[PDB]
Protein backbone atom coordinates (compact mmCIF):
# COMPACT_ATOMS: atom_id res chain seq x y z
CA UNK A 1 0.00 0.00 0.00
CA UNK A 2 0.90 3.67 0.26
CA UNK A 3 1.50 5.85 3.35
CA UNK A 4 2.10 9.60 3.40
CA UNK A 5 4.12 11.20 6.19
CA UNK A 6 5.51 14.58 7.13
CA UNK A 7 2.35 16.58 7.70
CA UNK A 8 1.86 18.85 10.67
CA UNK A 9 1.32 22.47 11.66
CA UNK A 10 3.61 25.03 10.03
CA UNK A 11 3.67 28.83 9.84
CA UNK A 12 2.77 30.72 6.67
CA UNK A 13 6.04 31.11 4.81
CA UNK A 14 7.39 27.71 5.79
CA UNK A 15 8.84 24.97 3.66
CA UNK A 16 7.98 21.32 4.22
CA UNK A 17 8.81 17.96 2.68
CA UNK A 18 6.30 15.12 2.59
CA UNK A 19 7.15 11.48 1.88
CA UNK A 20 5.10 8.80 0.15
CA UNK A 21 6.25 5.29 1.12
CA UNK A 22 5.33 2.17 -0.85
CA UNK A 23 4.82 -1.36 0.47
CA UNK A 24 4.15 -4.58 -1.42
CA UNK A 25 5.41 -3.19 -4.72
CA UNK A 26 8.37 -1.23 -5.96
CA UNK A 27 9.01 2.09 -7.62
CA UNK A 28 11.50 0.11 -9.73
CA UNK A 29 8.42 -1.04 -11.64
CA UNK A 30 6.85 1.35 -14.13
CA UNK A 31 4.19 3.58 -12.60
CA UNK A 32 3.20 7.19 -12.27
CA UNK A 33 3.48 8.24 -8.67
CA UNK A 34 1.45 11.37 -8.06
CA UNK A 35 0.56 13.88 -5.36
CA UNK A 36 -3.00 15.20 -5.06
CA UNK A 37 -4.25 17.51 -2.32
CA UNK A 38 -7.66 18.48 -0.98
CA UNK A 39 -8.38 21.52 1.13
CA UNK A 40 -11.08 20.98 3.77
CA UNK A 41 -14.44 21.00 2.03
CA UNK A 42 -12.97 21.64 -1.42
CA UNK A 43 -12.07 19.52 -4.43
CA UNK A 44 -9.24 17.25 -5.38
CA UNK A 45 -6.31 19.14 -6.86
CA UNK A 46 -3.51 17.52 -8.85
CA UNK A 47 0.00 18.66 -7.93
CA UNK A 48 2.51 16.52 -9.84
CA UNK A 49 3.36 13.06 -11.18
CA UNK A 50 6.64 11.26 -11.69
CA UNK A 51 7.43 8.26 -13.89
CA UNK A 52 9.32 6.01 -11.51
CA UNK A 53 11.38 4.30 -14.23
CA UNK A 54 13.33 7.41 -15.25
CA UNK A 55 12.16 10.22 -12.88
CA UNK A 56 10.51 12.23 -15.67
CA UNK A 57 8.17 14.56 -13.85
CA UNK A 58 5.09 16.59 -14.74
CA UNK A 59 3.68 19.51 -12.78
CA UNK A 60 0.42 21.37 -12.45
CA UNK A 61 0.76 24.92 -13.72
CA UNK A 62 0.17 26.30 -10.21
CA UNK A 63 2.80 23.97 -8.67
CA UNK A 64 5.84 24.21 -10.96
CA UNK A 65 8.21 26.74 -9.35
CA UNK A 66 7.00 26.06 -5.79
CA UNK A 67 6.62 22.26 -5.38
CA UNK A 68 9.19 19.59 -6.30
CA UNK A 69 8.43 15.87 -6.76
CA UNK A 70 11.32 13.42 -6.39
CA UNK A 71 11.99 9.69 -6.43
CA UNK A 72 14.32 9.19 -3.49
CA UNK A 73 14.46 5.36 -3.40
CA UNK A 74 12.73 2.27 -4.75
CA UNK A 75 10.10 2.78 -2.02
CA UNK A 76 9.87 6.55 -1.49
CA UNK A 77 8.74 9.64 -3.40
CA UNK A 78 8.85 13.09 -1.82
CA UNK A 79 7.06 16.38 -2.27
CA UNK A 80 9.02 19.51 -1.31
CA UNK A 81 6.80 22.54 -0.74
CA UNK A 82 7.99 26.15 -0.34
CA UNK A 83 6.44 29.52 0.61
CA UNK A 84 3.40 27.88 2.14
CA UNK A 85 0.17 29.81 2.68
CA UNK A 86 -2.98 29.21 4.68
CA UNK A 87 -4.62 28.22 1.40
CA UNK A 88 -2.15 25.31 1.16
CA UNK A 89 -3.86 23.78 4.21
CA UNK A 90 -5.01 20.44 2.91
CA UNK A 91 -4.84 16.72 3.04
CA UNK A 92 -1.95 15.65 0.80
CA UNK A 93 -2.37 12.27 -0.89
CA UNK A 94 0.02 10.15 -2.90
CA UNK A 95 -1.51 7.84 -5.51
CA UNK A 96 -0.27 5.34 -8.05
CA UNK A 97 -1.45 5.14 -11.63
CA UNK A 98 -0.38 3.31 -14.72
CA UNK A 99 -0.58 4.48 -18.30
CA UNK A 100 -4.04 5.94 -18.94
CA UNK A 101 -5.88 3.88 -16.32
CA UNK A 102 -6.61 6.32 -13.51
CA UNK A 103 -5.15 5.91 -10.01
CA UNK A 104 -6.40 2.77 -8.37
CA UNK A 105 -4.15 2.94 -5.30
CA UNK A 106 -4.20 5.86 -2.84
CA UNK A 107 -2.68 6.51 0.56
CA UNK A 108 -4.77 7.72 3.51
CA UNK A 109 -3.30 11.21 3.25
CA UNK A 110 -1.21 13.40 5.54
CA UNK A 111 -2.66 16.64 6.86
CA UNK A 112 -0.71 19.84 6.37
CA UNK A 113 -2.00 22.80 8.35
CA UNK A 114 -0.56 26.19 7.40
CA UNK A 115 -1.65 28.54 10.10
CA UNK A 116 -0.47 31.17 12.48
CA UNK A 117 -0.70 30.14 16.08
CA UNK A 118 0.80 27.22 17.92
CA UNK A 119 -0.34 23.75 18.88
CA UNK A 120 -3.04 23.61 21.50
CA UNK A 121 -4.21 20.53 23.35
CA UNK A 122 -7.94 19.78 23.59
CA UNK A 123 -10.05 20.09 26.66
CA UNK A 124 -12.37 17.12 27.05
CA UNK A 125 -15.79 17.60 28.60
CA UNK A 126 -18.55 15.07 29.15
CA UNK A 127 -21.93 15.47 27.48
CA UNK A 128 -24.99 14.34 29.41
CA UNK A 129 -28.61 15.48 29.76
CA UNK A 130 -29.71 17.76 32.59
CA UNK A 131 -34.62 6.66 31.40
CA UNK A 132 -34.14 3.18 29.95
CA UNK A 133 -32.12 4.79 27.12
CA UNK A 134 -29.70 7.68 27.13
CA UNK A 135 -27.24 9.36 24.82
CA UNK A 136 -23.92 10.42 26.36
CA UNK A 137 -20.79 11.82 24.79
CA UNK A 138 -17.53 13.75 24.89
CA UNK A 139 -16.84 17.24 23.60
CA UNK A 140 -13.24 17.66 22.45
CA UNK A 141 -12.74 21.42 22.44
CA UNK A 142 -10.09 23.90 21.38
CA UNK A 143 -7.28 21.98 19.74
CA UNK A 144 -4.81 22.70 16.93
CA UNK A 145 -3.90 21.11 14.56
CA UNK A 146 -6.05 18.25 13.46
CA UNK A 147 -6.28 15.34 13.99
CA UNK A 148 -7.61 14.01 17.22
CA UNK A 149 -8.63 10.40 17.63
CA UNK A 150 -11.70 9.45 19.68
CA UNK A 151 -12.66 5.87 20.50
CA UNK A 152 -15.02 4.41 23.06
CA UNK A 153 -14.12 1.68 25.57
CA UNK A 154 -10.85 1.35 23.71
CA UNK A 155 -12.71 0.46 20.50
CA UNK A 156 -14.72 -2.47 21.84
CA UNK A 157 -17.94 -0.50 22.16
CA UNK A 158 -19.57 -0.92 18.77
CA UNK A 159 -23.31 -0.36 18.39
CA UNK A 160 -24.49 3.18 18.55
CA UNK A 161 -21.55 5.58 18.19
CA UNK A 162 -21.79 8.84 16.23
CA UNK A 163 -18.65 10.93 15.90
CA UNK A 164 -19.30 14.16 14.08
CA UNK A 165 -16.88 15.95 11.77
CA UNK A 166 -14.71 18.53 13.45
CA UNK A 167 -15.43 22.23 13.03
CA UNK A 168 -12.78 24.94 12.90
CA UNK A 169 -14.03 27.82 15.03
CA UNK A 170 -13.43 31.49 14.24
CA UNK A 171 -10.52 31.42 16.72
CA UNK A 172 -8.74 28.95 14.45
CA UNK A 173 -9.17 26.18 17.06
CA UNK A 174 -11.05 22.98 16.29
CA UNK A 175 -13.75 21.21 18.22
CA UNK A 176 -15.38 17.82 17.84
CA UNK A 177 -18.10 15.82 19.57
CA UNK A 178 -18.78 12.12 19.79
CA UNK A 179 -21.91 10.61 21.33
CA UNK A 180 -22.94 7.07 22.16
CA UNK A 181 -26.40 5.66 22.84
CA UNK A 182 -26.73 3.28 25.75
CA UNK A 183 -29.41 1.45 27.67
CA UNK A 184 -29.75 1.13 31.40
CA UNK A 185 -28.25 -2.35 31.28
CA UNK A 186 -24.99 -0.92 29.82
CA UNK A 187 -21.68 -0.66 31.58
CA UNK A 188 -20.04 2.78 31.87
CA UNK A 189 -18.80 4.35 28.66
CA UNK A 190 -15.37 5.91 28.43
CA UNK A 191 -14.19 8.13 25.61
CA UNK A 192 -10.49 7.81 24.80
CA UNK A 193 -9.19 11.05 23.30
CA UNK A 194 -5.75 11.51 21.78
CA UNK A 195 -4.14 14.57 20.23
CA UNK A 196 -0.76 13.43 18.89
CA UNK A 197 0.49 16.93 18.01
CA UNK A 198 0.56 17.74 21.73
CA UNK A 199 1.04 14.18 23.05
CA UNK A 200 -2.30 14.48 24.82
CA UNK A 201 -4.05 11.34 26.06
CA UNK A 202 -7.26 11.54 28.12
CA UNK A 203 -9.81 8.90 29.17
CA UNK A 204 -13.18 10.15 30.48
CA UNK A 205 -15.98 7.94 31.76
CA UNK A 206 -19.32 9.65 31.28
CA UNK A 207 -22.10 8.99 33.73
CA UNK A 208 -25.79 9.78 33.12
CA UNK A 209 -27.20 12.99 34.62
Amino acid sequence: QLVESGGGLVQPGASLTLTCTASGFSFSSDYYMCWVRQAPGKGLEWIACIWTANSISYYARWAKGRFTISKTSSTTVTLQMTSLTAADTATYFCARGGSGDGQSLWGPGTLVTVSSGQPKAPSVFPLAPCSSTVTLGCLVKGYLPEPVTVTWNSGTLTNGVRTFPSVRQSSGLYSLSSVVSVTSSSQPVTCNVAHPATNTKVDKTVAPS
Partner: protein, 216 residues
Protein backbone atom coordinates in the same frame (compact mmCIF):
# COMPACT_ATOMS: atom_id res chain seq x y z
CA UNK B 1 -6.36 21.94 -20.65
CA UNK B 2 -9.24 22.91 -18.34
CA UNK B 3 -11.64 20.34 -16.86
CA UNK B 4 -15.17 21.44 -15.95
CA UNK B 5 -17.84 19.44 -14.13
CA UNK B 6 -21.53 20.22 -13.87
CA UNK B 7 -23.67 20.45 -11.95
CA UNK B 8 -22.15 21.39 -8.61
CA UNK B 9 -24.68 19.30 -6.70
CA UNK B 10 -27.65 17.18 -7.56
CA UNK B 11 -30.34 15.38 -5.62
CA UNK B 12 -31.45 11.92 -6.74
CA UNK B 13 -34.17 9.63 -5.42
CA UNK B 14 -33.29 6.13 -4.28
CA UNK B 15 -33.83 3.97 -7.34
CA UNK B 16 -33.51 6.88 -9.74
CA UNK B 17 -30.88 7.74 -12.29
CA UNK B 18 -28.50 10.68 -12.16
CA UNK B 19 -26.02 11.83 -14.78
CA UNK B 20 -22.95 13.97 -14.18
CA UNK B 21 -21.05 15.91 -16.79
CA UNK B 22 -17.38 16.51 -17.27
CA UNK B 23 -15.92 18.73 -19.97
CA UNK B 24 -12.36 19.05 -21.27
CA UNK B 25 -11.33 22.25 -23.06
CA UNK B 26 -9.42 20.24 -25.71
CA UNK B 27 -9.83 16.62 -26.79
CA UNK B 28 -8.40 13.92 -24.49
CA UNK B 29 -9.92 11.05 -26.54
CA UNK B 30 -11.06 8.32 -24.05
CA UNK B 31 -8.45 9.08 -21.36
CA UNK B 32 -10.74 10.29 -18.60
CA UNK B 33 -11.16 8.71 -15.16
CA UNK B 34 -13.97 9.02 -12.61
CA UNK B 35 -13.62 8.83 -8.81
CA UNK B 36 -16.03 8.54 -5.92
CA UNK B 37 -15.13 10.08 -2.58
CA UNK B 38 -17.02 9.58 0.61
CA UNK B 39 -16.44 12.19 3.35
CA UNK B 40 -13.27 11.53 5.28
CA UNK B 41 -11.92 8.91 2.89
CA UNK B 42 -9.49 8.86 -0.02
CA UNK B 43 -11.08 8.84 -3.45
CA UNK B 44 -11.85 5.47 -5.05
CA UNK B 45 -11.43 4.85 -8.75
CA UNK B 46 -14.74 4.05 -10.48
CA UNK B 47 -14.10 4.35 -14.22
CA UNK B 48 -10.98 4.60 -16.33
CA UNK B 49 -10.62 5.18 -20.10
CA UNK B 50 -14.03 6.90 -19.95
CA UNK B 51 -16.12 3.71 -19.71
CA UNK B 52 -14.08 0.82 -18.23
CA UNK B 53 -15.18 -0.19 -14.76
CA UNK B 54 -12.47 -0.56 -12.15
CA UNK B 55 -12.31 -3.78 -10.16
CA UNK B 56 -14.93 -4.13 -7.45
CA UNK B 57 -17.15 -1.35 -8.81
CA UNK B 58 -20.86 -2.28 -9.07
CA UNK B 59 -22.24 -2.04 -12.57
CA UNK B 60 -24.81 0.64 -11.72
CA UNK B 61 -21.92 3.01 -12.45
CA UNK B 62 -21.24 3.66 -16.16
CA UNK B 63 -19.23 6.19 -18.12
CA UNK B 64 -19.42 7.47 -21.63
CA UNK B 65 -17.93 10.01 -23.99
CA UNK B 66 -14.72 10.56 -25.89
CA UNK B 67 -12.99 13.78 -26.83
CA UNK B 68 -14.26 16.77 -24.84
CA UNK B 69 -17.65 15.80 -23.35
CA UNK B 70 -18.09 12.99 -20.81
CA UNK B 71 -20.84 11.60 -18.63
CA UNK B 72 -20.98 9.55 -15.45
CA UNK B 73 -24.29 7.85 -14.84
CA UNK B 74 -25.61 6.12 -11.74
CA UNK B 75 -28.48 3.84 -12.77
CA UNK B 76 -30.52 2.81 -9.73
CA UNK B 77 -29.18 5.15 -7.06
CA UNK B 78 -28.56 3.82 -3.56
CA UNK B 79 -28.13 5.67 -0.27
CA UNK B 80 -24.48 4.51 -0.42
CA UNK B 81 -24.03 6.66 -3.50
CA UNK B 82 -24.17 9.89 -1.45
CA UNK B 83 -20.74 11.22 -2.25
CA UNK B 84 -18.73 13.64 -4.34
CA UNK B 85 -17.68 12.48 -7.78
CA UNK B 86 -14.66 13.77 -9.72
CA UNK B 87 -13.43 13.41 -13.28
CA UNK B 88 -9.73 13.45 -14.09
CA UNK B 89 -7.81 14.07 -17.32
CA UNK B 90 -5.53 11.06 -18.08
CA UNK B 91 -3.64 12.24 -21.18
CA UNK B 92 -1.40 15.19 -21.90
CA UNK B 93 -1.17 16.01 -25.61
CA UNK B 94 1.81 18.35 -25.17
CA UNK B 95 4.01 15.52 -23.95
CA UNK B 96 2.02 12.59 -25.29
CA UNK B 97 1.99 10.94 -21.89
CA UNK B 98 -0.89 9.22 -20.12
CA UNK B 99 -0.34 10.22 -16.51
CA UNK B 100 -3.37 10.99 -14.35
CA UNK B 101 -3.56 14.71 -13.84
CA UNK B 102 -6.02 17.62 -13.58
CA UNK B 103 -9.40 17.16 -11.93
CA UNK B 104 -12.80 18.57 -12.55
CA UNK B 105 -14.38 20.62 -9.81
CA UNK B 106 -16.49 17.77 -8.46
CA UNK B 107 -20.22 17.06 -8.22
CA UNK B 108 -21.95 16.32 -4.92
CA UNK B 109 -24.73 13.75 -5.08
CA UNK B 110 -27.41 13.90 -2.38
CA UNK B 111 -29.71 10.87 -2.17
CA UNK B 112 -33.43 11.39 -1.43
CA UNK B 113 -34.47 8.56 0.88
CA UNK B 114 -37.58 8.00 2.93
CA UNK B 115 -38.29 10.95 5.23
CA UNK B 116 -37.59 10.59 8.93
CA UNK B 117 -38.30 13.22 11.60
CA UNK B 118 -35.43 14.09 13.93
CA UNK B 119 -35.35 13.51 17.61
CA UNK B 120 -33.36 16.17 19.46
CA UNK B 121 -31.02 16.27 22.49
CA UNK B 122 -29.46 19.22 24.30
CA UNK B 123 -26.32 18.90 26.42
CA UNK B 124 -25.80 21.62 29.01
CA UNK B 125 -22.15 22.52 29.55
CA UNK B 126 -20.22 20.39 32.00
CA UNK B 127 -19.48 22.21 35.24
CA UNK B 128 -15.75 22.68 34.54
CA UNK B 129 -16.27 24.52 31.24
CA UNK B 130 -17.17 27.82 32.84
CA UNK B 131 -13.86 28.42 34.62
CA UNK B 132 -12.14 28.34 31.20
CA UNK B 133 -13.73 31.62 30.10
CA UNK B 134 -15.98 30.09 27.42
CA UNK B 135 -18.91 27.70 27.43
CA UNK B 136 -20.11 25.44 24.61
CA UNK B 137 -23.65 24.05 24.55
CA UNK B 138 -24.27 21.08 22.27
CA UNK B 139 -27.50 20.20 20.52
CA UNK B 140 -27.89 16.97 18.52
CA UNK B 141 -30.49 16.09 15.91
CA UNK B 142 -30.58 12.31 15.42
CA UNK B 143 -31.31 10.16 12.37
CA UNK B 144 -33.33 12.36 10.05
CA UNK B 145 -34.02 13.17 6.44
CA UNK B 146 -34.34 15.64 4.70
CA UNK B 147 -32.15 18.48 6.02
CA UNK B 148 -33.10 20.56 9.02
CA UNK B 149 -32.34 24.07 10.14
CA UNK B 150 -31.32 24.77 13.73
CA UNK B 151 -32.23 27.89 15.68
CA UNK B 152 -30.73 28.81 19.04
CA UNK B 153 -32.59 31.19 21.35
CA UNK B 154 -31.16 32.54 24.61
CA UNK B 155 -33.81 33.95 26.93
CA UNK B 156 -35.99 34.12 23.83
CA UNK B 157 -33.50 36.06 21.70
CA UNK B 158 -32.43 34.33 18.50
CA UNK B 159 -28.69 33.88 18.33
CA UNK B 160 -26.85 34.83 15.16
CA UNK B 161 -23.24 34.22 16.20
CA UNK B 162 -21.19 31.67 18.12
CA UNK B 163 -22.90 28.79 16.28
CA UNK B 164 -21.27 25.94 14.40
CA UNK B 165 -23.00 23.05 12.70
CA UNK B 166 -21.58 19.66 11.82
CA UNK B 167 -23.49 16.99 9.90
CA UNK B 168 -22.51 13.33 9.56
CA UNK B 169 -22.46 11.94 6.00
CA UNK B 170 -25.69 10.35 4.80
CA UNK B 171 -26.03 6.84 6.19
CA UNK B 172 -25.36 4.10 3.61
CA UNK B 173 -28.40 2.10 4.72
CA UNK B 174 -31.21 4.60 5.24
CA UNK B 175 -29.90 7.91 3.80
CA UNK B 176 -30.22 9.67 7.14
CA UNK B 177 -28.16 12.50 8.63
CA UNK B 178 -27.14 13.35 12.16
CA UNK B 179 -26.34 16.88 13.21
CA UNK B 180 -24.32 18.43 16.03
CA UNK B 181 -24.94 22.13 16.62
CA UNK B 182 -22.85 24.07 19.12
CA UNK B 183 -23.45 27.46 20.67
CA UNK B 184 -20.31 28.98 22.19
CA UNK B 185 -20.46 31.98 24.53
CA UNK B 186 -18.11 33.62 27.01
CA UNK B 187 -18.53 32.60 30.63
CA UNK B 188 -19.75 36.14 31.37
CA UNK B 189 -22.37 35.84 28.64
CA UNK B 190 -23.40 32.35 29.76
CA UNK B 191 -23.82 33.42 33.37
CA UNK B 192 -25.91 36.44 32.31
CA UNK B 193 -28.78 34.37 30.87
CA UNK B 194 -30.94 31.48 31.98
CA UNK B 195 -32.92 29.73 29.22
CA UNK B 196 -31.02 27.99 26.44
CA UNK B 197 -33.10 26.59 23.57
CA UNK B 198 -32.30 24.48 20.53
CA UNK B 199 -35.06 24.45 17.90
CA UNK B 200 -34.75 21.99 15.03
CA UNK B 201 -36.95 22.61 12.01
CA UNK B 202 -37.61 20.14 9.18
CA UNK B 203 -39.86 21.82 6.62
CA UNK B 204 -43.10 22.53 8.51
CA UNK B 205 -42.14 20.43 11.56
CA UNK B 206 -40.19 21.62 14.62
CA UNK B 207 -38.64 19.81 17.60
CA UNK B 208 -37.39 21.91 20.50
CA UNK B 209 -35.12 21.10 23.44
CA UNK B 210 -34.30 23.54 26.21
CA UNK B 211 -32.68 23.74 29.61
CA UNK B 212 -32.34 26.33 32.36
CA UNK B 213 -28.90 27.15 33.80
CA UNK B 214 -30.22 26.69 37.36
CA UNK B 215 -31.76 23.25 36.86
CA UNK B 216 -28.52 21.46 35.90
Amino acid sequence: IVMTQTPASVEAAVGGTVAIKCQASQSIRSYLAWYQQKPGQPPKLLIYEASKLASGVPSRFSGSGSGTQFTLTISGVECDDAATYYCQRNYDSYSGAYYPNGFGGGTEVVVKGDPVAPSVLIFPPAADQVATGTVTIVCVANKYFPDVTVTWEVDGTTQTTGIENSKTPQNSADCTYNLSSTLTLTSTQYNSHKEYTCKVTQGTTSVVQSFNRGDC
